Design an enzyme around this catalytic site. Structure first.
Site, PDB file in Angstrom:
ATOM      1  N   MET A  39     -24.305 -29.210 -40.488  1.00  0.00           N
ATOM      2  CA  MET A  39     -23.865 -30.415 -39.826  1.00  0.00           C
ATOM      3  C   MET A  39     -22.526 -30.129 -39.121  1.00  0.00           C
ATOM      4  O   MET A  39     -21.596 -29.652 -39.729  1.00  0.00           O
ATOM      5  CB  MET A  39     -23.726 -31.554 -40.819  1.00  0.00           C
TER       6      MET A  39
ATOM      7  N   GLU B 207      -4.744 -30.250 -39.998  1.00  0.00           N
ATOM      8  CA  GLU B 207      -5.582 -29.196 -40.460  1.00  0.00           C
ATOM      9  C   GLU B 207      -5.929 -28.360 -39.228  1.00  0.00           C
ATOM     10  O   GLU B 207      -6.156 -28.901 -38.155  1.00  0.00           O
ATOM     11  CB  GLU B 207      -6.873 -29.770 -41.055  1.00  0.00           C
TER      12      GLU B 207
ATOM     13  N   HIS C  99      -6.908 -13.205 -47.105  1.00  0.00           N
ATOM     14  CA  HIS C  99      -5.902 -12.129 -47.015  1.00  0.00           C
ATOM     15  C   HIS C  99      -5.070 -12.306 -45.743  1.00  0.00           C
ATOM     16  O   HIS C  99      -3.845 -12.272 -45.804  1.00  0.00           O
ATOM     17  CB  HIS C  99      -6.563 -10.745 -47.046  1.00  0.00           C
ATOM     18  N   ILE C 100      -5.740 -12.543 -44.608  1.00  0.00           N
ATOM     19  CA  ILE C 100      -5.041 -12.781 -43.352  1.00  0.00           C
ATOM     20  C   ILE C 100      -4.030 -13.914 -43.462  1.00  0.00           C
ATOM     21  O   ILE C 100      -2.860 -13.755 -43.083  1.00  0.00           O
ATOM     22  CB  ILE C 100      -6.047 -13.030 -42.208  1.00  0.00           C
ATOM     23  N   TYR C 101      -4.463 -15.044 -44.026  1.00  0.00           N
ATOM     24  CA  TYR C 101      -3.596 -16.203 -44.103  1.00  0.00           C
ATOM     25  C   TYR C 101      -2.459 -15.990 -45.099  1.00  0.00           C
ATOM     26  O   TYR C 101      -1.337 -16.420 -44.828  1.00  0.00           O
ATOM     27  CB  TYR C 101      -4.407 -17.482 -44.381  1.00  0.00           C
TER      28      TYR C 101
END
Ligand SMILES: [Ca+2]
Ligand SMILES: [Ca+2]
Ligand SMILES: [Ca+2]
Ligand SMILES: [Ca+2]
Ligand SMILES: [Ca+2]
Ligand SMILES: [Ca+2]
Lengths: 176, 170, 177, 170, 176, 177
Positions: E31, E86, E134-136
């Protein structure tokens, strides 16, 4: 002459009947629909009522006796090509146990078959609603299906019985 | 390589020719139509209505058929579905494959509890396919449709989400 | 009908917007009053606007009569009422295709649609009383005369009398099924 | 005798006075309001919107408070709820009772899978009530609201339908 | 000078970008939402796009490199009183594995903090999305929550991790 | 403030439709141009229509100043921009309640709302340069002069010069929190 369901009649539902309709179950305990659109609040019902005033896919009638409102007849899913409709009889809780369910069912059958010219009327009732099953069997309805876990009600899936009757059998048995 | 994709406006000519014979009443969001122009107007009026959902069945870039989910109710967590295969592709086992795609969408995407379908009682082949997929008969709706001059009786079959997710979703 | 038969390729299909120029030229002569869902029109533009306004109206239904992909004529079912389970029909054949028996064939197709698809009980038609040939065709198809509407239409300077003929669903389904 | 009934237009004055102090931003279907007239217009605009649902909490015919279900999503089968008790009725154990009514509606009527709530991290009493009802902490949202000149941190707590229906629906 | 994510930039989403947006996931497998309203069909997306053109509660940007469209940045639930939003980064599958996710995340942070003047940015990712986590983490985001069984996807409930970063830490670390 | 204190009962509440007659009579003299969401009005009926058109517009916010249930005046926050995090405010005291120190008290309430509820960074106001008393009140509350807008308003036959004064969120939250 001497009976209590002798004043029972149908009349078309009016806007002024909506408060009576709404209080048949304003408990936040079930989802309610008007022309297949959900509502809870009275104001929401009123707006849906206005939006569907010319829609012929459903028709509703107040059941009354001696001027007091005892219940509601609904015909829904009306289709004039297949010549069928579903109906339901709702008796106000304060008027249950006086034989009005059975009498109103005959009035609904008479309207559907003798006025609307339908071929098939059917209804759905909970499988454990033994009293209603008995009433409808006695009126000539036959069981056509057992719809398994068709409604989520009060935390559990319930199974319903679909019963039907046809126009020829009706007109023969009650218009002889 | 059989797959579903969302129905688009440009799919309507394909949908319409699945049965443009003036031989049956057809419905779009429960409103009758016959003419292509009537279908197009109904399509436009219901573009955001969530009570039905449609998908084109395709294989190798060709349009094979249509899946419809109708009478969708998310409180009771059910829907009816229908599979329509183009006549020119009926010989090739796409009915069964499409039914599994419809089941997958309804149960694993839409999060429904119950899916059911209606088939003519004389359609023994379709009944057999659906029985093999795990559907059970729940009713025999007598003289439910007037078609080509006579009342036809249909079989309602259903299947539930736990059985599905167990059998095809481990 | 099998290998060695005469069968007609005459068929009905639902009227579309793109058919309106064909409909309009069936009689654009300023010689008769024309109606669409009971609303008068003369100009093509007026027909188009009426068409748009009534696209979902179920009280009338129209079909193009075609043979071998050519447009031959129009079938109209009007005054449709599903409670009394009746409708009126009319067959209109383009002047360039008259005299080839398409009226009769189209009438059977209209009867089949009205009775076997629409689930009507009664179909009826109106024809000029002087139109003996059309009366005979409809009599042969099983229609019975139910009435003679006297001076019911003012046409071309005079009041004309018409014959109303009807046929019912049980008789039809028996005789052609 | 504590019960829920559907919010009506005539309940709006009661709702509005639960906090008409020009001290917080309030929302109706995610649209801001302060003035009563602004609330009334938003109410009218969203009367058929199913993404939020509200109920008056009443006991012995008096209005005690409001239950709101918001962010309702029937595919993911979740909603947020909030219980607001009128200040004049805060002393009487209605918070806990109302929470159970909200749970009952969300799980046994609406057929949701997950209900969650947000409470200020300093609101130890409410946290304790919800822990006792079976809610588990799933997050600590840091400086999520600017209130009265400072960023406040809130606790998100959740509970699921199977545990609920087992414990209260036999 | 010598790197491959040097041409990466943001620009405002336009109507003409909708076909690119739609094909990021037109599989009837999830959705999808536009300003919190569901859609599947391209025509449905287009109508929702038109209806929300002046709505400031969400903002979207195409990620591009050397004129080709590589992905989408979405800022949603934007609230200027609480000063938060967000965000999500979506990289087209054909452009994954070239370091664009990380670069686009920095562009989204820069827009949210240095242009929109937000205080808090947060994101949600699947708990099993170890690479994105990991990136964040490397960019300075901290874990604030583990939302249990928050999304029904492909037949099962998935748990997500909510991560956040604040404006002071950002402006210090990347605008020194 | 505790048992033995002087405290004012002055408060703000959100402006409602029913407050418009009070707003209108603050200055219905055909002596000044009046604006609602930057649209001019004179007539009460015109104000009411503008009120209805902007009910959900967030670019301005208004509050009635009241004391002991009597309406004393109006606070307006205008030119609100949440990206630059600023707004202009004005305090208007009904003529029958002037000279009782409600301007100063209302200003503190407006500062509190703008900084602690709306999360703004900068609040500013405009005052006539000849209004030395108001300038002094705002200086005492912590506002600094940022500029002198020369002949910015034509009022009562002459161009007037105004002083723009401002205060910032960190200084406010420190000094009154
Ligand atoms: Ca229906
Ligand atoms: Ca339906
Ligand atoms: Ca008529
Ligand atoms: Ca939302
Ligand atoms: Ca939102
Ligand atoms: Ca401005």
């Amino acid at each position: 002459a001497m009976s209590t369901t002798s004043s029972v009649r149908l009349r078309p539902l009016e806007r002024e009947d909506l408060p009576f309709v709404h209080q048949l179950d304003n408990n936040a305990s079930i989802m309610r629909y008007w022309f297949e659109e959900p509502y809870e609040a009275f104001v929401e019902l009123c707006d849906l009522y206005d939006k569907h005033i010319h829609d012929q896919s459903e028709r509703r009638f107040i059941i009354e006796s001696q001027g007091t409102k005892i219940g509601l007849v609904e015909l829904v899913e009306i289709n004039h090509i297949h010549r069928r409709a579903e109906f339901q009889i709702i008796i106000d809780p304060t008027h249950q146990g006086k034989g009005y369910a059975g009498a109103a069912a005959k009035l609904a059958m008479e309207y559907g078959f003798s006025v609307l010219n339908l071929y098939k009327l059917y209804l759905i009732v909970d499988k454990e609603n033994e009293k209603a099953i008995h009433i409808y069997s006695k009126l000539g309805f036959e069981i056509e299906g057992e719809l398994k876990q068709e409604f989520f009600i009060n935390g559990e899936y319930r199974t319903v019985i679909r019963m039907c009757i046809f126009q020829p059998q009706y007109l023969a048995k009650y218009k002889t």
